[PDB]
Amino acid sequence: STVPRLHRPSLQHFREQFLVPGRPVILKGVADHWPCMQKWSLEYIQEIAGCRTVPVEVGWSQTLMTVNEFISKYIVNEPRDVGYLAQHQLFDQIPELKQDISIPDYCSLGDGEEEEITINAWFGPQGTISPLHQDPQQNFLVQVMGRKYIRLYSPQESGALYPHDTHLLHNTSQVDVENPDLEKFPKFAKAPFLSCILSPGEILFIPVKYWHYVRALDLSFSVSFWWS
Ligand SMILES: O=C(O)c1ccnc(C(=O)O)c1
Numbered sequence: 001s002t003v004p005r006l007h008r009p010s011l012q013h014f015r016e017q018f019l020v021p022g023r024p025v026i027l028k029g030v031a032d033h034w035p036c037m038q039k040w041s042l043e044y045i046q047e048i049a050g051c052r053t054v055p056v057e058v059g060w061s062q063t064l065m066t067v068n069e070f071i072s073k074y075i076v077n078e079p080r081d082v083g084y085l086a087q088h089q090l091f092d093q094i095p096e097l098k099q100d101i102s103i104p105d106y107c108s109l110g111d112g113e114e115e116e117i118t119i120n121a122w123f124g125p126q127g128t129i130s131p132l133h134q135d136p137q138q139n140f141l142v143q144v145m146g147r148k149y150i151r152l153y154s155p156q157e158s159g160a161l162y163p164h165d166t167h168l169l170h171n172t173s174q175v176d177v178e179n180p181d182l183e184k185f186p187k188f189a190k191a192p193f194l195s196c197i198l199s200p201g202e203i204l205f206i207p208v209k210y211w212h213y214v215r216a217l218d219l220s221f222s223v224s225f226w227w228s
């Protein structure tokens with residue numbers, strides 16, 4: 001089914017109907033006027049961050065290059081490979097960019113300290129795919145540039161998602177969500193899920209341990225807030 005969209009729900013409504021039960025929701029009217037939403041063009045990103053080194057996932061391997069190199073080789077110049085500036089604390093590295101975002105007020109409903117919230121950038125071309133996996137904290141995934149198709153499976157469906165047997169990857173599914181091998185993974189077919197297309201200015205709440213799969217539909221920039 002679909003992820004519900006709510007305009008600026010109260011702290012109490014969000015706590016009682018989504019955070020405590022662990023139900024996903026898209027928050028509208030919250031981040032839509034953050035400065036990032038108008039400011040972050042490719043040219044602006046190059047101007048403020050182009051000379052800084054970032055980690056880039058290619059394919060599968062992990063390499064290092066400047067933001068300018070990343071844009072030239074994996075965004076603009078008919079890229080040969082898929083490259084993704086994924087899961088990087090860009091705002092600690094470049095505190096000027098931190099001025100263009102905010103910590104969602106809803107994070108204050110958590111038990112953790114604000115100083116411990118992890119803010120990650122996810123910047124890449126159309127077609128980046130993040131396989132189905134779960135994380136150990138709550139998340140607000142804020143979409144800034146482009147759209148993402150996102151599939152969500154409750155932790156109650158873990159049995160049908162065939163987690164990898166190793167400890168390192170036990171929080172990642174063996175299944176390719178959009179082309180599953182149903183001969184090897186038959187239980188996957190019947191597992192219920194939610195999905196959405198997350199667009200600029202929208203925030204997706206991903207409850208702690210909810211399984212999520214993410215495919216960029218356009219040139220995309222997202223900012224995640226991992227919090228407890
Ligand atoms: O946007 C993504 O590609 C992505 C992938 C994995 N996890 C997250 C997240 O925000 O936790 C985001």
Ligand SMILES: [Mn+2]
Nearest residue numbers: 133134135212
């Ligand atoms: Mn994640």
